[model samples]
Target: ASKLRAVLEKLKLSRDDISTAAGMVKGVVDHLLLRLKCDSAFRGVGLLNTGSYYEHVKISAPNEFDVMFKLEVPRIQLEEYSNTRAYYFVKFKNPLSQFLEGEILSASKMLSKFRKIIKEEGSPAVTLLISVDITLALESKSSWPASTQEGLRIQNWLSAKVRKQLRLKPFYLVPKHAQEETWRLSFSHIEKEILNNHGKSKTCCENKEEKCCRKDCLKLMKYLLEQLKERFKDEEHLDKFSSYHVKTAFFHVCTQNPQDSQWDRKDLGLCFDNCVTYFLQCLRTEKLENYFIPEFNLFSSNLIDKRSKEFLTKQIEYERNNEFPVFD
Candidate 1:
């Protein structure tokens, strides 16, 4: 247990490591983003950050990021897919609609133009270029979508008031290849705020009030998964897995164990184990629900094949049952 605890501490990025690399990351992103603003379609660009790095669960280096460029779009009507329930065929009422005809957004065409803007940035940074997955999102400042009714079940973890406020914030739609004309509902903005408002009090874990090991458990689980991926890099199924799946289950587990007592720093090992257990259960059942859209099954065959899921399930079970030897 002590070995595991020590490893958990080691997985963290030291403040010095964070400050130096994050500055480099911000420099490249800030400069290129400024360059994006000069163009017309992206003139209204608003930068938003999401994913593990921003959530503070990222390990090793700060080279990876999920930075979103949210563009302003006029009032648009959203029609949800009956089958998937999260993908929408957005209909607009502005000149921007010139790119639409079938009540669908021409994302392939639109995003290609956005790509050329990047080519024009003449972006030159350090040789080991910090990997940034720059995604474009259209902001829908109207209201929350109905598909998320049972989603973000965090009232048990963050309280009903926090849920209400998060719902009030505008949601986003990003270019997805669901059907080429569809955009998937995005809660990047809502997710960015959840970590800060995690526990019972406003400043719950800000080294002010109560302390919790939720973040550490998340980090451990992520580290474990990363090790698994690297050791079995040729295992195609494992390649499909990402830290996002673990983080999603972490949110779900938080709802299941709402009391901060369940995540005490002393019980870090148990907390991390619980997260892994939930993840294994998700794989076995082939029912990893998208944290924001319950209807979206991330573990579904559409995303990752069934045989691959089963293979990963067995591999993870073996590693988990064998005390995670690779963790050493």
Candidate 2:
């Protein structure tokens, strides 16, 4: 138990580490946004720091980053191409019209242009030790689809007032997600917001006496998953299993157990066990639905083959029974 606590504590990002990473990443993103904004072709480019860093679940070295360079445009038409309503075909109000000198309002075209600029700059317009994934996304300030609204249980867990505020938040369309010419609707901003205010009470973690280890549990899960990936490096099926899957499961578990007392800081290990148990049950059923889009069956997609799922279930259970050997 002490070993597990020590390792989990080590996984956390120190104040110095967070500050340094934030400063470095901010400088790079700011420079990129400046150039994109200056170019008439890429007007209204908004920068949003996303992914694990902003989500506060990042572990180990702060070497991986994701930033969204959002392109804000006028009213556009959205065509759903996937049953999940996660992927879409974005078209301008007038498809034939040019958004810039020669560019139509197409996700593929915009992404291609951004790639070209990156390729042309050989010597380095910006350099960093960490690897950063810059996404050229189109911003949509509108209501989430009906499918999404139904999947999200924040209204029940939080209050209707908080739910309304979260729903009103803007969503994004990212280029080149599943295939060429495809745009996937993303709620990275909303995900960040949820993680930030995850406590049952608004001030659950604000006061010393009211603190909980919800985020700590998430980090432990992420870390465990990372170790599993390393152990099964040769198994391609495991590639589809990402930290996001674990995160989605965590949110679902949280909603089901909305009381702050359920996640007291002192019982982090017990809480984490419950979370892992839920995740294994999800895998066994092969039905880990996306929290924000029920149509997206994360497991049924066959991303993680049945054989791999069974293997993971066994491995996770082994850890649970053996004090989580992966942590050692």
Candidate 3:
């Protein structure tokens, strides 16, 4: 118990750090919103607090933030750029289509303008405050990909009604690269929604009768990944496996073991062990599918090499067998 307690304490972030990081993020978001207000390209956009911090699974120091700067434009269409359905091209609807010549908005132009504004803001403040990763995106109010219709298997574990509600959620489009014509579709907003309401029942974690350690297990895995990076600092290939991969693996675990009882609060160690073992399985098999977009194999060879896979597998085994000395 002392060993688990020590590691868990290290994994927990102080409220002061979380509060300070929150304020820093708010300031940056407000600055970006104000600076982009005058641009016609971003006429109706807002920044959404997304990622690990917002999901409440962040661990260690609060040094990085993720802000999804989403632009709400008139209805638009999307053409898939790749099989993953992760990238796309946006097309404007008719009526005022003559403005952009009936074509989609240029993702490159939008990103270039965004980058220029970030530079113009001129700040050690933007620098000194905290490192923020801003995802420039366009909000598309269109039907989702056919793949997503059957992709999220929550319904199989939950109910048909629950699945329908999730499927009805809005979709988004983000640029793949500033120089490319391709735009990547994102569901960060939906991801946030699921993480927040991730209980078996609507009010599962809202009271005493429904507490579980799902989020705790996720934080542990996240911390373990961070430690592995430091341990293998010389092995640059290990950098390929980000916290997101661990997160995606956890989400799959939830769907596989849907009941709250499976993640009993009293058995945190057991639950966390199950989560780690599941992650090792992913690394070994090299098939961590994207939660929202099942077609996207997040562990593709392009992202992680064979050497990295073997190295991560061995490290996880060490932690599992040694009560996570890595946390020390």
Candidate 4:
């Protein structure tokens, strides 16, 4: 397990493919006996199914590939943005009748790729994966046009297009394992610690906190914390949990030029730092230490741009000051 996990950390395998890799290894190993016991890497893996399935496969290079029992191709939805307008919205006035043809053509290309991969591998035994990060509505303080809404525009557009093209059934290829066992970093006891720490450290829930809760951002933070707690109910920590690494990968699409780059720059930078610090603090309080994987997927409007560099510095500082010290 340790050997396999080590490779996964540095591997080029896509996020969705990990499960397929895991399944492949377990299947091979169980065919024999006396499985390799790499206790160190135990915390890195979470198993959902167990028994002979886990004991069957062989793990070689984790960094190069991720194995899973089944696979799911991506389904995407799309949205178009107009540079002329500076408002947030999910609905568009233009009908997509003609564009639907373009969408279909794109789908055909995807199916072709799938076919090619399967043919090269010569078996459905090849790994399958899915990218399932979800998007939330965000509100910006900058002035907005009369009509406005929030959500990732490209996400919806591409997801819709892919679904329409494949006409695939839900959970078609990704089936539940025959045996019901899941291996994961143990997170069964972190809840108590999280609450205890949260109560001890400062909470932004004070009366005046609403001023900073633009677009109900505070509400979202609280909800995200709750979900994190629910997700990792078995981990614990003493001073801190350094072994657990929470990371995120994402994309950002900007639809408009900034009306005031300077002000927008500062506010946006602060917002990013604040969001991450808060989330990490909650993790400390919840004791997601031993089990929770500290990785995230964040597709957004920008990348390593100048604004991002400034925000990164602030984020570093925020982590230093927070009671849980973000890294914890």
Candidate 5:
């Protein structure tokens, strides 16, 4: 399990066709086994699936064919090699192991014979396997934007002081590329503050303090977004997205149900997943509604250039079901 994990660290070094190649090997080999059984000496012969491909750890090796397995040894006595759950001892009678011959059947010798069988049979098997940011300055904020009148439903989560402290702060003025570099709203500190004290109870997410999945789901979702952006970075399908919007989407759900119990740490993974449908739903609905402004909508036609919406919806929808192959 661990051996294949390293390949994942290198990169998602694979293509859709790699699966095609790996799967092809299965029938190709199975047919070879069928032909082998036709031989009287190997009537009981069968194959055992092995290696990284069968183990589901195949990666980065389409050019390096890797169809691995062992033929079920016929009439071979066996004994477990060691305490290890793998490997075996087999003294073959029909085909002697003299080449790599040992007092007992030698793995190296049988592999050698398999090499001969492969050559004599003619080798048949072949298989293989940016972010952003900004500067900001803010003075006096509005009443959390009247549009977000129903937003910041933190009373059930953060304490009143934290919310009031957040609300009393101002918003940021960020420029938009609306052909004239116009200005738009921005709020960093408040965003930071809410998450900092985001626990429904005073003891939320501290050292030895009761844990919450709020940050876990938020960060996980954010990371998924971040990675997906990288995946399609060459295109604008997800260009309109930013981590902040991920937070907003998360915040929207937070406000929708506003309760720490819903984000229990034990349910951390499920909570993030549950939130995914909401995020995708909004994308499909064509709005990552501004967290603080009910009027402003993200993922819109008027907001940014013709950055494709369905493209992103298609991406998230795929990842949502595909277990995030983009997530390694």
Candidate 6:
């Protein structure tokens, strides 16, 4: 409480006089967060790495109460600063899942509790990082021996699937680095300026180092869905989990650094998991449910909470019933 009071007091006064005092308080919190209290590094995909850390930037958005933000991972040796690593990123008014909307609301309510718990710097830094859970699933492909023909076959298969599912116009997916290559081709014509070296910065670069492809993959996936509608005329299962799974195969390939092309196969399973999680958020434009829905097995330790369960069981009792188009 003293730290927060100090922060508030410093904020009230001029930083010229109290800057060092404020920084000393901040230093203590940073040391505590570096202890790594999160569930990552022990199990469930994150164990593959030696360790990781987190940072986020506060943001303003069109939607009220939604803290627009980006999670950053500063650990791991990789290139690009674009991909590698993942996070339990929080958002507001997310339209995709019945669970996420409530989670954001609950988290927002709990934001005040973090007043003294989290650093008051209000920016991405060592002190502000709350958790480190992004286990670069894209880099999971490094399991295979690079020179082997079998590895190339697996890589090619994933690339082919991305090409077909995204309905790529035969221009992308040609590079030996399947994931990066696919993204380079996919975003070559996007409306936004797709810069090559935009991922680097002063504090940190991305752990996986290829996340820049996340946006491109999303665009290409949406385009493919449009093609499916235009060609096969199939709209019923457009964004269903079934359709989503098939489209997510390529993320396993595309979500890694070019240098880490030989990650172990055991890690590949998590890579697929990471891709699906991201694909839902980026491509289908939805939030991820903590539960495993397909086959309806109540096995996984992670499951949506009671509130989410209630929302899923009966649609009528749901709070926000309106959903919107993610790609239009």
Top lDDT hit: 1
lDDT of 3: 0.72
Question: What lDDT would each prediction earn against the true structure?
Answer: 0.74, 0.72, 0.72, 0.26, 0.54, 0.26
Positional deviation of residue 169's Cα in model 2 after best superposition, in angstroms: 1.3
lDDT leaderboard ranking:
1, 2, 3, 5, 6, 4
Better of 5 and 6 by TM-score: 5
**Each candidate: RMSD:** 3.5, 3.8, 3.7, 21.1, 25.4, 20.8
Candidate 3, TM-score vs. the true structure? 0.88
RMSD versus native structure for model 1:
3.5
Show the lowest summed lDDT stretch of 10 residues, model 2.
120-129
Model 2, which residues run further than 4 Å from truth? 13-15, 49-58, 94-105, 122-129, 177-179
Question: Lowest summed-lDDT stretch of 10 residues in model 5?
Answer: 129-138
CA deviation > 4 Å runs, candidate 3: 49-58, 94-104, 122-129, 177-179
lDDT of 5 by residue, 1-328 (tens): 2322332334334445556655565655566556656644345444322222322211233433433333333343333333211123334344333432454544333333444454455122222221111121112234444434565557656656666666775543322223222233445446656677776676677755477778667756766776777778998777777666778888877776567778776776578777887888877777777776665666667654443667777888888777677666
lDDT tens per residue, model 3, 164-205: 886676777777742367776677676667777888777878
lDDT of 2: 0.72
lDDT (Cα, 0-100) at 6 in candidate 4: 33
- In Å, residue 252's CA in model 3 sits off its true spot by 0.7
Instruction: Score residue 9 of candidate 4 by CA lDDT.
Output: 36
Task: Give one digit per residue, the lDDT tens place, for model 1 in 1-328.
Answer: 6767877667653445656666666677688778878866667776764532352334644556546777888887888765777788888764455467677778776777777777766011112235666677889888778778889888777888888888888888887756677777878667657755677656668773478888778777787778877777876668788877887888888888888889887888788889888988998889989888898898988888888778877877887788878777
Models 1 onward score TM values of: 0.89, 0.89, 0.88, 0.20, 0.54, 0.19
User: What TM-score, to 2 decimals, does candidate 4 have?
Assistant: 0.20
In Å, residue 23's CA in model 4 sits off its true spot by 18
Model 1 CA lDDT for position 224:
79
